[PDB]
Amino acid sequence: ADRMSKWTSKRGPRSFRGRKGRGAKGIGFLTSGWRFVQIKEMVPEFVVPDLTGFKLKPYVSYLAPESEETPLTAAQLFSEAVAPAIEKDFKDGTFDPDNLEKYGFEPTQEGKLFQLYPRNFLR
Amino acid sequence: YEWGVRSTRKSEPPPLDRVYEIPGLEPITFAGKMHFVPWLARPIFPPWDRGYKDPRFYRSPPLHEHPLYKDQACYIFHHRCRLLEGVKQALWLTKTKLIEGLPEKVLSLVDDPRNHIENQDECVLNVISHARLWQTTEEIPKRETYCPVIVDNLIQLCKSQILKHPSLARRICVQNSTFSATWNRESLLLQVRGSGGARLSTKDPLPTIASREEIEATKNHVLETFYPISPIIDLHECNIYDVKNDTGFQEGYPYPYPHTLYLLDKANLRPHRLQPDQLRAKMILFAFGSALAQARLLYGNDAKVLEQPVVVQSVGTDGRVFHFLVFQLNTTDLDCNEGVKNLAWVDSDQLLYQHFWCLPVIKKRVVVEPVGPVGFKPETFRKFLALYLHGA
Amino acid sequence: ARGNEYQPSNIKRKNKHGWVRRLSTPAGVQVILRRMLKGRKSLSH
Amino acid sequence: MKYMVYPQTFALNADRWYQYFTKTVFLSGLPAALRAVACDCLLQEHFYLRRRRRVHRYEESEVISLPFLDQLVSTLVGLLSPHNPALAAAALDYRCPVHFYWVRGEEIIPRGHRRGRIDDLRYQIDDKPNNQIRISKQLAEFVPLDYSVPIEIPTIKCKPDKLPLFKRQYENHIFVGSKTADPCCYGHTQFHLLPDKLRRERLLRQNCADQIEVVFRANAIASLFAWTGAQAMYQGFWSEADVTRPFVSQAVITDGKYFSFFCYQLNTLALTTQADQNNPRKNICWGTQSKPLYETIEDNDVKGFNDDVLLQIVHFLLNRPK
Amino acid sequence: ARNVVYPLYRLGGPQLRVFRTNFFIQLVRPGVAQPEDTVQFRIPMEMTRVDLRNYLEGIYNVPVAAVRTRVQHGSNKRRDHRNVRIKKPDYKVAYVQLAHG
Amino acid sequence: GLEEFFDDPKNWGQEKVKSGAAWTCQQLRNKSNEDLHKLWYVLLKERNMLLTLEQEAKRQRLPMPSPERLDKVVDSMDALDKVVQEREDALRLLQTGQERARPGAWRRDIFGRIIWHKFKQWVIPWHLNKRYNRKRFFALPYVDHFLRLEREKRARIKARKENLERKKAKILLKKF
RNA sequence: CCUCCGCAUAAGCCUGCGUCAGAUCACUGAACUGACAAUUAACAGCCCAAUAUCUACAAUCAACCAACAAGUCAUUAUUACCCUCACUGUCAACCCAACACAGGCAUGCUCAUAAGGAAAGGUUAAAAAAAGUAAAAGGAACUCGGCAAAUCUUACCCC
RNA sequence: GCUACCUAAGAACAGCUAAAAGAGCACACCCGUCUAUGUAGCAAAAUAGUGGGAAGAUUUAUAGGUAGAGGCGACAAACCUA
RNA sequence: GCUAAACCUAGCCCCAAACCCACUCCACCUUACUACCACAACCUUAGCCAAACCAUUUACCCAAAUAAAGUAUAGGCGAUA
Ligand SMILES: [Mg+2]
Ligand SMILES: [Mg+2]
Ligand SMILES: [Mg+2]
Ligand SMILES: [Mg+2]
Ligand SMILES: [Mg+2]
Ligand SMILES: [Mg+2]
Ligand SMILES: [Mg+2]
Ligand SMILES: [Mg+2]
Ligand SMILES: [Mg+2]
Ligand SMILES: [Mg+2]
Ligand SMILES: [Mg+2]
Ligand SMILES: [Mg+2]
Ligand SMILES: [Mg+2]
Ligand SMILES: [Mg+2]
Ligand SMILES: [Mg+2]
Ligand SMILES: [Mg+2]
Ligand SMILES: [Mg+2]
Ligand SMILES: [Mg+2]
């Protein structure tokens, strides 16, 4: 006879308490006789770098001078990545409206391991 | 009168939107927004195929599409088959004549008092009492618990005679082994697939019981027939099969000879348990199958009368009633009814004990019958030992 | 003796007065709609 | 409410704890054509007998390893029956359960309506060994009672719960493999096969490479104490009326490739706090490292069959009551 | 990582990875007497014991032998001036048994 | 090791720890892509230390040495995440012209209100999905009256707000 | 001195007599407030590739016998199939009756306890009232009626 | 989620006599004959004692169904959240 | 002398003007707030009440305020419309 409390896996009868969980992402499946099969590949792997000889530390010196905040946009990214290559190739006759893929553009995301839309990677 | 009422079946899909009929135009459907709405038309979807294979979500080919599919129907006899006519049917299929009682050779084995084990009666009763009363924690053990354990202990008991007989060192008992044997009878294709544990395996084949004169005498006898029952009734009628004769072992297996097949009826329910007649049928076909498999291995795939017959024997039990069979396969040309016939000696309804009391019966505060086996007879164990000591 | 008419269970509570039970019929939908307009914090069990 | 003691356990360092519960000192060491029959059983399961349904890697321990161990025990006992007349008459069981129930130590209930009352800890061990051999006459002891040893019983600081161990209430059982009315009450040898969950290559996958020997050891101590413990009870001995002779049994624990051997002597059932207060007498368990029986099996032969392992199986079977 | 949509896997897929992991840990002093090898942790709900194993041995190079978890229920008994229940949040507790003794 | 869940023993229970300023978004933008990834784990370990330190103070019933550190650390990582997010977002625009990483649609729930429905991933196509087809992404007519009442309600609240604004200005004029 | 209660599971409830500090029929305290702790899976939940195809004979110690209301439990053929122990429940003196209510409340084990409990705030010994125990001689004379207490009867009539 | 009835899949019934039964005595359980207490009570129907049944048309746990111009009913105008 | 008493401002009401909000990450129609597998919507309002009962009947928002006009007309030619 309570409506206002949050509904949880603690709360039902036996069957109910089995079915619901907390938020944890499942990492396998079940087979006959309730045997759990784990898939190694479904388990997230921590991609953790080498920290040896690394100068950056978690806090910053106050002695550092202040600079104006300017966020990143597509326009300026194009200007400081693609634009110099394009204009340099515009000077000669190497540039082409077709096959501009040389500059880093891709027609499709289908083949890629890291597909941008829809996103297929974690963080 | 057709079966399956109308309400239970999958409902006939609703009639198509009338827009689809008009040849000029294509309908506006709710395909575009990826959900149902009632006002737009129902789209027709092209059938879908998962491009990759996934084991859990697998759909098998139609039955014609399987590689092993054949127009000619093979009939398979397995462990769960139950013959309608029993031994009568079994004999027909295996082309055999039965003889009541065991062979004289095996009965002569328990003739001498020497071959008897020390404290035979004491031991046998102990086996029954261990299996049937003292076994587990709970008071009254069930059949599937007591049936294999009683046989295991009776095998152990016979196996103690190694002291007396060195020949017993030349055998093993194997579990979870399988045989396959295929033949023809009036150009019906039949295949026996034998499953189940407790196969007695020896380095040496059994010598033949019956003489060549006996084998020649079988020719005059005619196989018994039953009408209007077909001899193929109660066998798994199969269109998808492969023909193979298998002894269940790879080439160069030590102990490759089938001495005895032990068969159990470890079923709790009466309807689940085979009838006595039906069980004797099962062991005939199994013994035949095991003998025929071995015959095909070393004598080839030809249909002929063998110069030296193969002997296999079998024991079938429920834990209480025992059936003993000796089988002799002397011929492989089985397609025609007339000629040389295989041989079978059978003893049936030989029960080890009449009843068993787990708990003492008290009527008016006095014990009518005490705990234990009731109506025990040792002659059935003698027969069991006789079959064990054969070929030793 | 009376008063103990409520003999509780989670299964029964949910199958009778739950969100899925509510949305199952148009009548129930309107029940939810009402509670939303009134500003109830419990729309259903 | 009793603790459920699991003989075959995933608990880290579970040998230490089991020694506490049973008051057991663990000691390192011990107190022909058989090769042909041994390797033939290996080849039977692995090679010679062909399988209709394909063998999965999870099912291999139950379908390959288990029927192998079934086979080896039954053959060796029959073959050695002329050597040892005891084994001729001996009864052997396949997957028969064994139960023992004892009390050791006390607690004060921390919370509830019974808070601050004295209570005793109950331990129940239920085990189903793959094979066991029972005899009518007791085996002779290894060492006498009051056999002082200069090695201390392990003591656990915290609650028994902190090693993952759980309390449950059910039927309290003493059982030797058969009921009381069976004359073969005394215990010869147990054969255990470890579950596929406690396999060594899985244990190498977790960082716990040092725990492979713990699993073997822990199984022995618990299951043997249970078995001898139960036998002593069938002779009328219990907590207050402690044993007047030693009760001995021996065990063979395997994973199908690696074999361990153990001998157990039970000297005392005085485990209850009141009984234990003044009693220097201890239970003793002997054991050795796991050794591979065979290196590998390819086609039709076994590579690097180690004979001494097979003989240690023989030497245990050869033991007879005097 | 938590509060992100995990990309689906089909057989023969690429190995799922995280590069920056939302999970944050506290190592806490146990309220009950423990074995010396056992150490206690407060853990995000959505974290698994598999995750915590990998987390510790990955980032901290701590070899672990065994991990067991449980979900601690925070009390909802407390009430404010407006007589409304104040919920103390539920958290996950992970016990880690270290390896190599 | 497990030891690095705690800071340097020399500064244990020191009442005050001198700590640096939180990283700025600008500073992090100058930093390399790979280097941000490395810095991010440096910030991870630091967070966990401070979180365990928070809890230990809470247990001992003592004040934390420098609680503001935690805030700084948090902010730095917020900043870092934002910086990285920006890069991904930028690249998406240049490659696909999609503003949102996860696909979705404007839909009409049964309550007749317009929602941004986010998609989920499935193995099978939508028409074959039993659970998905159970959902109603449309409003039947009976809902329209409620939509009216809802609107009217919103209007009332708004009207009330406006009035009070004016009234307040009036009294503020009489006092000044 | 009492125990027809207890211990456990289920069902229901949701931190609801653990620790520490203030604070207030009874302690100036606790079943009050705040802060801090805790319940670790082996038990239990959470399952299963496909298309055909199989499945006449109860249970009751299942034996003899005996029925009627006719009964909880089985596959085979071929194809496909190699990775492992994840997730959730686990506390308490507790639930439904507005209440710390002589009421309600399923199963297992203990059938009297090894477990769990306390009828008397202090006194005095009035009346009337409630529940007992005993009672000379008599034995229904009481009363609508042997109601009640007793005692632990017999023969009928109406329906 | 009470109660009336049904559906699915369960569970319970000691001891003693009985030619063996919708049998008899009699626990647990289910019901409520008669008396007294209670009557803002322990209780919006209880308690103490005494009684009826207690292997059956029995009792009972779980889930589902039938809805008011109606349901359900071994008909009491009974029951369908005091 | 206790218990008390006393307060002005939160806000709100009716107008006018003007056509409104639908919203970081995650989750949410299965037992909502739960990562992850082969049916469908449109269908005369009735009644209280008035008629001193009641039975035909009895005002109810339809797109310019005023006036035409409570007029023509309808109605158990009556209530009334
Ligand atoms: Mg009920
Ligand atoms: Mg758990
Ligand atoms: Mg389990
Ligand atoms: Mg007590
Ligand atoms: Mg009192
Ligand atoms: Mg008084
Ligand atoms: Mg008086
Ligand atoms: Mg008198
Ligand atoms: Mg009179
Ligand atoms: Mg008178
Ligand atoms: Mg009377
Ligand atoms: Mg009725
Ligand atoms: Mg009766
Ligand atoms: Mg009666
Ligand atoms: Mg009437
Ligand atoms: Mg009447
Ligand atoms: Mg009127
Ligand atoms: Mg009037």
Swiss-Prot record, chain A:
Protein name: Large ribosomal subunit protein mL41
One GO BP: mitochondrial translation
Keywords: Apoptosis, Cell cycle, Mitochondrion, Ribonucleoprotein, Ribosomal protein, Transit peptide
Assembly and interaction partners: Component of the mitochondrial large ribosomal subunit (mt-LSU). Mature mammalian 55S mitochondrial ribosomes consist of a small (28S) and a large (39S) subunit. The 28S small subunit contains a 12S ribosomal RNA (12S mt-rRNA) and 30 different proteins. The 39S large subunit contains a 16S rRNA (16S mt-rRNA), a copy of mitochondrial valine transfer RNA (mt-tRNA(Val)), which plays an integral structural role, and 52 different proteins. Interacts with BCL2.
Cellular component terms per the entry's GO annotation: mitochondrial inner membrane; mitochondrial large ribosomal subunit; mitochondrion; ribonucleoprotein complex
A GO molecular-function annotation: RNA binding
Pfam families in alphabetical order: MRP-L27 (PF09809)
Record localization: Mitochondrion
Organism: Homo sapiens
UniProt similarity note: Belongs to the mitochondrion-specific ribosomal protein mL41 family.
InterPro entries membership: Ribosomal_mL41 (IPR019189)
Primary location group: mitochondrion
Tissue: Present in kidney, liver, thymus and testis, and at lower level in brain and spleen (at protein level).
Lineage of the species this protein comes from: Eukaryota, Metazoa, Chordata, Craniata, Vertebrata
UniProtKB/Swiss-Prot annotation, chain C:
GO cellular component terms listed in the entry, alphabetical order: mitochondrial inner membrane; mitochondrial large ribosomal subunit; mitochondrial ribosome; mitochondrion
Cell location: Mitochondrion
Disulfide bonds: none
Residues that bear Phosphoserine: 24
Superkingdom in the source lineage: Eukaryota
GO biological process, one term: mitochondrial translation
Gene Ontology terms, MF aspect: structural constituent of ribosome
UniProt keyword annotations, A-Z: Mitochondrion, Phosphoprotein, Ribonucleoprotein, Ribosomal protein, Transit peptide
First-listed, main subcellular location of the protein, grouped into a coarse class: mitochondrion
Family: Belongs to the bacterial ribosomal protein bL34 family.
Subunit structure: Component of the mitochondrial large ribosomal subunit (mt-LSU). Mature mammalian 55S mitochondrial ribosomes consist of a small (28S) and a large (39S) subunit. The 28S small subunit contains a 12S ribosomal RNA (12S mt-rRNA) and 30 different proteins. The 39S large subunit contains a 16S rRNA (16S mt-rRNA), a copy of mitochondrial valine transfer RNA (mt-tRNA(Val)), which plays an integral structural role, and 52 different proteins.
The name this protein goes by in its record: Large ribosomal subunit protein bL34m
Organism: Homo sapiens
Organism placement in taxonomy: Eukaryota, Metazoa, Chordata, Craniata, Vertebrata
Section of the entire sequence shown: 48 to 92 of 92
Swiss-Prot record, chain D:
Keywords: Mitochondrion, Ribonucleoprotein, Ribosomal protein
Lineage top rank: taxon: Eukaryota
A GO molecular function held by the record: RNA binding
Tissue specificity: Heart, skeletal muscle, kidney and liver. Lower expression in placenta and peripheral blood leukocytes.
Compartments it resides in: Mitochondrion
Main location: mitochondrion
Cellular component aspect of the GO annotation: mitochondrial inner membrane; mitochondrial large ribosomal subunit; mitochondrion
A Gene Ontology biological process term: mitochondrial translation
Keyword Mitochondrion tagged: yes
UniProt similarity note: Belongs to the mitochondrion-specific ribosomal protein mL65 family.
Assembly description: Component of the mitochondrial large ribosomal subunit (mt-LSU). Mature mammalian 55S mitochondrial ribosomes consist of a small (28S) and a large (39S) subunit. The 28S small subunit contains a 12S ribosomal RNA (12S mt-rRNA) and 30 different proteins. The 39S large subunit contains a 16S rRNA (16S mt-rRNA), a copy of mitochondrial valine transfer RNA (mt-tRNA(Val)), which plays an integral structural role, and 52 different proteins. mL65 forms a heterodimer with mL37.
Protein name: Large ribosomal subunit protein mL65
Gene symbol of the encoding locus: MRPS30
From Swiss-Prot, chain F:
Residues carrying N6-acetyllysine: 82
Compartment annotation: Mitochondrion
Keywords, alphabetical: Acetylation, Mitochondrion, Ribonucleoprotein, Ribosomal protein, Transit peptide
GO molecular function, one term: structural constituent of ribosome
GO BP, one annotated term: mitochondrial translation
Principal cellular location given in the protein's record: mitochondrion
GO CC list: mitochondrial inner membrane; mitochondrial large ribosomal subunit; mitochondrion
Family per record: Belongs to the universal ribosomal protein uL29 family.
Subunit structure: Component of the mitochondrial large ribosomal subunit (mt-LSU). Mature mammalian 55S mitochondrial ribosomes consist of a small (28S) and a large (39S) subunit. The 28S small subunit contains a 12S ribosomal RNA (12S mt-rRNA) and 30 different proteins. The 39S large subunit contains a 16S rRNA (16S mt-rRNA), a copy of mitochondrial valine transfer RNA (mt-tRNA(Val)), which plays an integral structural role, and 52 different proteins.
Name the UniProt record assigns to this protein: Large ribosomal subunit protein uL29m
Organism: Homo sapiens
Parent sequence residues shown: 63 to 238 of 250
